[PDB]
Amino acid sequence: QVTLRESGPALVKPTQTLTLTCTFSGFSLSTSGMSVGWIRQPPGKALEWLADIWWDDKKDYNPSLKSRLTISKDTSANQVVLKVTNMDPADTATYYCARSMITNWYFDVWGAGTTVTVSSASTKGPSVFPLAPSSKSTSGGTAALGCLVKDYFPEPVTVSWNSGALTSGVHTFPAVLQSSGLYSLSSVVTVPSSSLGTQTYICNVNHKPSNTKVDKRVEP
Amino acid sequence: DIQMTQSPSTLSASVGDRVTITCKAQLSSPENSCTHFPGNLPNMLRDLRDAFSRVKTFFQMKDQLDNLLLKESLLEDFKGYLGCQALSEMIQFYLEEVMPQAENQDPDIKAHVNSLGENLKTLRLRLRRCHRFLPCESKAVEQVKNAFNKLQEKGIYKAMSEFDIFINYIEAYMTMKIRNVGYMHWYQQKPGKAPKLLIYDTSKLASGVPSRFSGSGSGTAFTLTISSLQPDDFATYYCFQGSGYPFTFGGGTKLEIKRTVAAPSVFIFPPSDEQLKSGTASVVCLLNNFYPREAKVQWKVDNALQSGNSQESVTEQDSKDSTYSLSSTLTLSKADYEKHKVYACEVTHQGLSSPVTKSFNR
């Protein structure tokens, strides 16, 4: 129905302040009864409600982290801002904004969420290497190929194939944290064996935390 | 502060099975914010009792009758299913039929009664602003009103003398309401995506949620039942409460879908020349579409079993065929890599009758 979109840094340093912005459409925070709230989810943990704000400018905060939270709204711009002070590595999480209503008191529509990492380390873009198809990656009328997206920080990174024209058969593996402190993943796709000498396969890797765009051709 | 114990934390069931997720609520004892509203309710009861204490004698002496008007039958209504409607009817009764004509004698009594009525109005507004206490969603009140009607002038005096009892009934209603969760909601979350509203108001199906889901419960025990499990039901499920600040979630239930054993397809990829130029060699082993999740992948470099130089990554269960995929990446330095010839990935899995090895020579 309605749509919401979060935006903010991918990386903040310990003790700095995070500023998250929610932009919404389809409803108005001038509409009586309307509300926007913030929820977070650390890696591998449960959802945790952070804050909310209502059309009458009343605000509410989770005591488990209050003194560090400030929610505000700009109804002319359809935006809500959350500020979290004195950021700690334990605040590394994906942050969502969501809509609620005085007739509801639950969040019915959520944004996609945005990922925030607290670290003293600096952003680093990935290296993309081909995982080339060959006789050792074939299985019946099928051959697997891929891209290794290595040594980047922080999360996330996105991978498409042939500018999105190739979607079926793609497994993009969850990143692993390496002993170097940098992340690494692979994206693989199976294709008809017969198409290897004809169809060009290019992986499109995007690392927004570092303004990095890479296209790698994967040849047999 | 309302906390939710969700069980089971993890669950693996077969297609067509019936699964029940339980969310047990646990409570903790908590001016113009909803966050401190049910904690500030005792203070409003205190304001009401003080003000009424300053007029109790005047009205108990002016009322020379002995038949109780607010009988416990009214409290039975208050704590019952239609209790919300009963309470608001009583509030309206006092604000409109008893208090306007009781407050006009002494300026002292008028001030006390007007404070009582203003607190009743403010309570009505706050219950309405917070957590859907109002508006609602009772023969005792009808009998109260009928007796009050029959009592003409003496009726106002009677109801005002029993205002302490009324306060106690309000207190009992609010205590019952805050020691319980009005509604339980449920969210379904697919890996790497925002939660989706699954069930709301304890038992109602949200958009695009099939008949296979149902919700139930009251007070402190709530449940989410999937009657006939489907491959797409793989997910993490969270109960959520909006009845009190802070809003809270359950611990979550991760639900995996059981299926028949499927053996993996094994592929191996040597390092690219582009990476070898940079001083590092990564060898990738791919196990595609297998069930169950457990698999043993070992690296052998010139027949030497390796340790400490590989990392695994495994996909989330497929929402269609219920399988997994796994990559194992062996990372060596280029020099180290060029000291050896044979690089092998060996896979043991339930779907394989003997371990499968994919290898290549450098």
UniProtKB/Swiss-Prot annotation, chain B:
Keyword Disulfide bond recorded: yes
Cross-referenced Pfam families: IL10 (PF00726)
Disulfide-linked positions: 34-130, 84-136
Gene Ontology biological-process entries: B cell differentiation; B cell proliferation; branching involved in labyrinthine layer morphogenesis; cellular response to estradiol stimulus; cellular response to hepatocyte growth factor stimulus; cellular response to lipopolysaccharide; chronic inflammatory response to antigenic stimulus; defense response to bacterium
Record keywords, A-Z: Cytokine, Disulfide bond, Glycoprotein, Secreted, Signal
UniProt cross-references to InterPro entries, sorted A to Z: 4_helix_cytokine-like_core (IPR009079), IL-10 (IPR000098), IL-10/19/20/24/26 (IPR020443), IL-10_CS (IPR020423)
Tissue: Produced by a variety of cell lines, including T-cells, macrophages, mast cells and other cell types.
Chief subcellular location: secreted
Location in or out of the cell: Secreted
Top-level taxonomic group: Eukaryota
UniProt-recorded Gene Ontology molecular function terms: cytokine activity; growth factor activity; interleukin-10 receptor binding; protein dimerization activity
Cellular component, GO, one term: extracellular region
Subunit structure: Homodimer. Interacts with IL10RA and IL10RB.
Family from the record: Belongs to the IL-10 family.
Role of this protein: Major immune regulatory cytokine that acts on many cells of the immune system where it has profound anti-inflammatory functions, limiting excessive tissue disruption caused by inflammation. Mechanistically, IL10 binds to its heterotetrameric receptor comprising IL10RA and IL10RB leading to JAK1 and STAT2-mediated phosphorylation of STAT3. In turn, STAT3 translocates to the nucleus where it drives expression of anti-inflammatory mediators.
Record protein name field: Interleukin-10
